Assembly symmetry: C3
Homo-oligomer: 348 residues x 3
Amino acid sequence: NSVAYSNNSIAIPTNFTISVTTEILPVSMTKTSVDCTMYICGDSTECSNLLLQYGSFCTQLNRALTGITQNVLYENQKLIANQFNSAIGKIQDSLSSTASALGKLQDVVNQNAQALNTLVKQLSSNFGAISSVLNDILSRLDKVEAEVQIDRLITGRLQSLQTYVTQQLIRAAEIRASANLAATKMSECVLGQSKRVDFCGKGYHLMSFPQSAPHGVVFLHVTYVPAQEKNFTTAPAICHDGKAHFPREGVFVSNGTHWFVTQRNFYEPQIITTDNTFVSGNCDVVIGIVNNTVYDPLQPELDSFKEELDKYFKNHTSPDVDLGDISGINQKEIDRLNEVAKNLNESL
Amino acid sequence: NSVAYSNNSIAIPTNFTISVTTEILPVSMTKTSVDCTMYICGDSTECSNLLLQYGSFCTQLNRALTGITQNVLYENQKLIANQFNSAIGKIQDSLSSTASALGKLQDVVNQNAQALNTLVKQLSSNFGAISSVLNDILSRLDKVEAEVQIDRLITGRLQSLQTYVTQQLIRAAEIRASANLAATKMSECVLGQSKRVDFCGKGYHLMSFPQSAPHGVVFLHVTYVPAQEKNFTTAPAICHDGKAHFPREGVFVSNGTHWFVTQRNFYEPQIITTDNTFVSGNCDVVIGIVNNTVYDPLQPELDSFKEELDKYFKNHTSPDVDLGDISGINQKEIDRLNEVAKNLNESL
Amino acid sequence: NSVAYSNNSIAIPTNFTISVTTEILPVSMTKTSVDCTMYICGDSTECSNLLLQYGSFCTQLNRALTGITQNVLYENQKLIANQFNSAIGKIQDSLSSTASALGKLQDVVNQNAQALNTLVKQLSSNFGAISSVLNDILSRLDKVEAEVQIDRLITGRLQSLQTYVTQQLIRAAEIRASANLAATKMSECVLGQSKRVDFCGKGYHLMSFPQSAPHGVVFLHVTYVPAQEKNFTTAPAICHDGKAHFPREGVFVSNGTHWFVTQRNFYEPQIITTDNTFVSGNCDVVIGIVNNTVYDPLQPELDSFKEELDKYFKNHTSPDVDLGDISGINQKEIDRLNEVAKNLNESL
Ligand SMILES: *[C@@H]1O[C@H](CO)[C@@H](O)[C@H](O)[C@H]1NC(C)=O
Ligand SMILES: *[C@@H]1O[C@H](CO)[C@@H](O)[C@H](O)[C@H]1NC(C)=O
Ligand SMILES: *[C@@H]1O[C@H](CO)[C@@H](O)[C@H](O)[C@H]1NC(C)=O
Ligand SMILES: *[C@@H]1O[C@H](CO)[C@@H](O)[C@H](O)[C@H]1NC(C)=O
């Protein structure tokens, strides 16, 4: 017998004051379209120019927000002439061979001088070619290493603009429920005298007069409130000798000695009769349970970043460049000939 | 005494026509799961292959959407022989030294020819090595400079798909409120005869019959509407000699000469009595104010992009490459020897 | 005459059991603020350090979530001496010219040896310079080609965190409607005895007692339910000789032989009278239609990726590097002089 037969002090309205309410309801959201350049980048021209390659995403966000003795002296004469004549013929061999040698040395040394001037003109081409191609690699790699950090910050400002767009769509879907509230609250109270307490102005309703506002309706409700209420002990029902008895359109207001079915909203007692009450059987309480569970979504739970990264990274290190190490490739006769050019006159 | 005692013409229902309403309510959203490749990239294979490195984000979005004288002639003979014998010994010195010199020149010139063929084989290695390593740097840098612009456009299409997912979750959270409206509107009108005007069909309610639809309920409401209404002047209350008097379940319909408490929803006058009215004291109006402020969120306001960028940029420019400038490193005797090889026979 | 005059079996309440309901309503959401590092990257330090360059986007998401014979022998003596004296003067020319030649060969060969040691010291500089500058280009390009795949996965985890933030704002905008439901459901039932069936506990309302819970209100409703109901055939209205007749606060309960206006919620018949019914004219049914179309947004439809890419791509291929092709730049007299240095003694 838990609570259905407990008696507790309940306030029941004892007189009235006449009153009026001004109640303001908004009935209509202006389309807060966003320029996506000025939001994300603003004045800063390098990121602005990057925004064009993010495509027409800005428009896409605005679709959302815009909606919503003579013999031996003579034989010595034969002898010395035969020694001389044979010597000079050996001088001509000695000298002709030296000319044929020194003329092959002067050939090959000038062919070497030609080869080195060929090498210098070709290597001037290589250090000139590498000057231009490697200056361009340097100048363009400096541009590309300036440009992946600005995209990083644009992409984190994209999320700030997507939080802007979400909170601006969220509010517009509350506004469209407040326009449904303005529809039911217009209908039931401008087209319809209510018997509900505090709907259509504080207290109890007499009459109303709507007036417009720029995006709203305002109601003048004429109503009466309780100027003066008393706590009567009560029960919702009473179980006499195993039968439960309970009101019809009232409560059991409790007098010191008797039960009366007062109207819930006023102290005006009337006697228990089979026309003021209903009746039951066996004196039992039915117990009901209601639990208004408002949706808890499937939130997007993820692996640790190491697992979702390692699924698809290559730690490729290019080798230390080694190339060819070219450091590993490593007068007396003219004095005499000048001396004997003089000292041969001592044998003239 | 603002509005509670003003009298204005109010329409009060004068006859009825019987009527029926067909009212359609949707009570149930099909799970619009999205393939994230086909949405963002479509057929285009280079961006498709990039999508795999964005991780399983697609699934994460689908968790959401799937939820929700003889002596001097002889001394001259001694003399000339002594001059000749001494001269030839000086010829052998002159010639042996020239051979030892010209044999050191032919040694060193062929050691130079060896060194230059060593240099050409090592430099053929360097321009062949740099050919391959620098072609790869060129060929791969062209690939990497093709691949940061396609990620830009994928990342702006991600926001278009996140606006898709947000508007598809927003609608599903309206659908779940329309399924709560279908619960109260089923209960109060299929299980319960309403005393409300225009709830359960135009006019006043008699009876109803629900019928299903594929994702909805449809009600046949049987109701009566006012076929024919008259404007009576009225007041919500009247203050006689400093006491306010007001109805009980009606309005003061105003006849040319008397006040009657008509029922709000019909013209049927009844006389003012203490059983048709309540009464007050001192003739004052209570004024109430209600302002139904619907949530305005903390929207994500940001610095200018220059401040949020400059927090974390280095304008490093690599110097213009300069390297070594190798352009800054800059027969008559054989004719005679051929001539005296002939002209020495003139002294044979 | 479609449905307004059809008669069908309707259940009308025949006794009561007293009952109590416990009804639980949540009235208040704890601020689930998110550390954005631990959500997206977690422990993994390389992506963590990247998060700083995405800016204070994390804060921006937390603004949202924290809200919400002697002569001829002598003439031969003159002759041979004149031949010898003239020959030696031609030897001095032959030898002085050879010295002046061989001294220009020994000059130019050592000037060549100087030029090649100059070349090797300058080229040691070039292969040393290119060693350092090209090792840095290799070492830094390896760093930059490691650093665009981790940003890809951060940017797809950003969308997972933006789905988290959207579903956490969506739920908080349902919570703020459930706090409006707790306001009306507190007011009409703690401050006000309802005449509605199943609002304020199963059945019909007597009385109630609210009790708090940590984020909720719980109502004890005392109510009566129907312990025991009978199907009477009925019509909502009847059209006698071309006039439609219909109840006032009841239904036409159908007895075997007569029509009675029973109260909708109880079987208790009363006779048709002009005080139990309203009356009409011409016997016609008005037909009304109501179609409660719940917002279907402008969803962000996009071109194919090829069109939105091609608006802003350059397929620049750098040419195959060609450079200078240096492979296209391509003892007997000392034996004799050693032989005649010996064989000239045969003419001493
Ligand atoms: C209800 O109140 C009356 C007096 O007001 C008292 O006599 C009675 O015992 C109370 N009911 C219960 C169950 O105590
Ligand atoms: C309450 O109303 C009654 C009924 O007329 C009246 O007699 C009584 O004086 C009123 N109370 C006050 C405080 O005015
Ligand atoms: C309504 O029911 C009665 C008997 O209950 C029957 O005589 C009458 O014909 C029914 N109405 C119609 C239109 O059939
Ligand atoms: C229903 O109520 C009546 C009225 O007192 C009673 O006579 C009847 O026995 C009750 N029915 C049951 C099954 O108790």
